Design brief:
Length: about 220
């Protein structure tokens, strides 16, 4: 209803869409500039800006965050209400995209870190037949009480993680990958770890995202 983002429009008329959520801290300009490179002329890239809220993980100081974060471990408490609220906020945008001529199976939800976490939770709870997920160096929020759900989960997941990630533990990403394959079809989930890289992306990971989106959103 009230979306502010750095949207990358396609060269041709937009038939597919990607909603990418940046990591905790910055805005959508970084990932907009990054996704402008890997770019299919019929796919739009929406990169919203996270609202500046207090984050308990760091002295409860104010910074852009999709929800309230308290830890980066599987045993850490989670802002259940905030996660569900932000997931509804993302579902509204998905439904707007569908309402203006972009079907659900042409919409890909992606993100990085906390953005990738919110994207994973949204697409695994969205009742509309979404196309796929692109989760880079993140985790699944509220993974325990998760029926290993949503609706019509024929989703294609491309999860990528830094092997030497000092922020989000790589074993948290591995647990998330093993918990995702429980829900959807395990043949539809790719979980690529990248040696040497840390809490960051790399051209190989960007190329994996390019191939995933190119074979998941073809020029139809």
């Amino acid at each position: 209803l009230l979306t502010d983002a750095a949207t990358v429009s396609g060269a041709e008329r937009e038939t597919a869409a990607v909603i990418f959520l940046h990591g905790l801290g910055d805005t959508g300009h970084s990932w907009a500039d990054a996704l402008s490179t890997i770019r299919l002329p019929h796919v739009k890239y929406i990169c919203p800006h996270a609202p500046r809220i207090p984050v308990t993980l760091n002295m409860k100081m104010v910074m852009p965050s999709w929800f309230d974060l308290m830890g980066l471990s599987p045993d850490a408490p989670e802002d259940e209400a905030g996660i569900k609220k932000a997931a509804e906020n993302i579902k509204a945008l998905i439904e707007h995209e569908m309402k203006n001529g972009i079907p659900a199976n042409r919409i890909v939800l992606g993100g990085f870190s906390q953005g990738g976490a919110l994207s994973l939770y949204t697409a695994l709870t969205c009742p509309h037949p979404l196309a796929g997920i692109v989760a880079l160096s993140c985790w699944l929020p509220l993974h325990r009480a998760f029926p290993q759900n949503g609706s019509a989960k024929d989703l294609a997941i491309l999860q990528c993680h830094g092997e030497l990630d000092p922020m989000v533990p790589v074993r948290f990403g591995a647990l998330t990958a093993e918990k995702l394959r429980s829900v959807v079809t395990p043949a539809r989930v790719q979980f690529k770890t990248y040696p040497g890289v840390m809490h960051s992306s790399c051209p190989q990971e960007m190329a994996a995202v390019k191939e995933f989106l190119e074979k998941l959103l073809p020029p139809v």
